[PDB]
Amino acid sequence: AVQIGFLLFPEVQQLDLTGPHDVLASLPDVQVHLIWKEPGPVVASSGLVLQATTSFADCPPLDVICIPGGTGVGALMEDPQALAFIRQQAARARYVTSVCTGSLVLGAAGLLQGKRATTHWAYHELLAPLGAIPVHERVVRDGNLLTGTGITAGIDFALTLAAELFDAATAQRVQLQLEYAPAPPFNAGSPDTAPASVVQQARQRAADSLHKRREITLRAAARLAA
């Protein structure tokens, strides 16, 4: 059985996780784990309560590890236990992946040094201090590292992983079973296509979080410099 693990942490953006989870759980001969320090409830940023299934110590060696984003990444970027677990699993994983601000966690773990990567548009300036080569694309692949942006990026890259782990016909069958053919009613999903007034409102709402995240990023970068 292919072993796929998602890190599930307090204040996660749950869709970053639940999207790819439902796709990958559709595949044959896969086991999906929701990993935290202990099994039990974990509350997402929206208040939705999820359940971690395994601890760091009990988690089997993973073939795929996926780091979701969300408000809670700031704490994770300075959690030595979580960072050590991610480094241990990434050493042997076939695929290391992240969604949204999850790539900042990979950065704090040292896994982006010299690698092309992306993250959520409002936090993109934080990739370079973590050693990454920042790339403004929706999905960025550097070796076995995939980083993606947007709330379907984990769905979109899960279909890519299905095609490589199995075959293209399997990925297409899953897409058809899920009738996945998105058609958003607006075209404001990127700062390059949204109206300028909307971009301003979004940047203003993220300003305090960005300010705090920069402080955290500099401390995380200092640990990598040692």
Ligand X SMILES: */C=N\c1ccc([N+](=O)[O-])cc1
Residues 2-21 that bind ligand X (CB under 6 A): 13, 16
Site membership for Cl ion, residue 182 (CB under 5 A): yes
- Which one of 33, 115, 120, 213 is in contact with ligand X (CB under 6 A)? 120
Does the active-site annotation cover 66?
A: no
Site size with a second copy, rule: CB under 8 A: 65
| Cβ closest to Cl ion, residue 37 vs residue 141 | 141
Q: Is 29 left (phi over 0), alpha (psi -120 to 50) or beta?
A: left
Dist CA 132 CA 135 (whole Å): 9
Site membership for a second copy, residue 201 (CB under 8 A): yes
Least distance from ligand X to the Cβ atom of residue 217, Å: 14
> Which of 217, 225, 140, 151 has the alpha carbon at shortest distance from 184?
151
Question: In sequence order, which residues have a C-beta less than 8 Å from that of residue 105 and are 6 or more positions away?
Answer: 7, 67, 73, 76, 77, 82, 83, 86, 98
Q: Which of 100, 106, 127, 171 is catalytic?
A: 100
Least distance from a second copy to the Cβ atom of residue 40, Å: 11
Residues 38-57 that bind ligand X (CB under 6 A): none
HSE, CB side, 13 Å, CA atoms: give it for residue 169. 0
Site membership for ligand X, residue 72 (CB under 6 A): no
Site membership for a second copy, residue 19 (CB under 8 A): yes
Interacting residues with a second copy (CB under 8 A)? 13-15, 18-19, 21-22, 25-26, 32, 34, 41, 46-51, 100, 120-121, 138-139, 149-152, 155-157, 159-160, 163, 168-169, 171-173, 175-191, 193-195, 197-199, 201-202, 205-206
